[PDB]
Design a protein around this ligand. Structure first.
Ligand SMILES: Nc1ncnc2c1ncn2[C@@H]1O[C@H](COP(=O)(O)OP(=O)(O)O)[C@@H](O)[C@H]1O
Lengths: 48, 48, 48
């Protein structure tokens, strides 16, 4: 169920404010780089 | 002097309520708004 | 690692609802809140 495990911060008013530039600039280069995701999977495999 | 492309403050204000503004832009609106307060308080506008 | 002098998010959250933050502080709080979102969303935290 989608209801089953909600993110409680989504009810907060702050969750309505669109994402900043600061954050798109910090994240987008990383998670849109197929290499970066593969490093992350790799490193998690190594931990798990 | 006539100024171009503006709208009634409340027109925009209520849209912003539906759509919140990016926090950086909103920080700007707030700086402008403070200036309004200052002006209207000193001249003690009767009709804002 | 232990981190000192933090409080339950909603403790402050409620206190801010009462007496709001200077816009600069509030812009800051929102920058952080977005980082939390990204983090909780990637690891699809079931318990936030
Ligand atoms: N890294 C930390 N630094 C400071 N305080 C913490 C940290 N981790 C947990 N706490 C505090 O200790 C309490 C218990 O921590 P935790 O075991 O993470 O939560 P829970 O009790 O839900 O399992 C929390 O209410 C939190 O305020």
């Amino acid at each position: 169920s989608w209801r089953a495990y909600p993110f409680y911060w989504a009810w907060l008013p702050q969750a309505k404010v669109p994402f900043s530039q600061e954050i798109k600039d910090l994240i987008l280069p990383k998670i849109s780089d197929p290499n970066f995701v593969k490093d992350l999977e790799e490193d998690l495999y190594e931990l798990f | 002097l006539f100024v171009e492309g503006y709208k009634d403050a409340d027109y925009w204000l209520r849209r912003f309520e539906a759509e919140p503004l990016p926090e950086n832009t909103n920080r700007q609106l707030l700086l402008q708004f403070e200036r309004l307060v200052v002006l209207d308080y000193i001249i003690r506008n009767t009709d804002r």
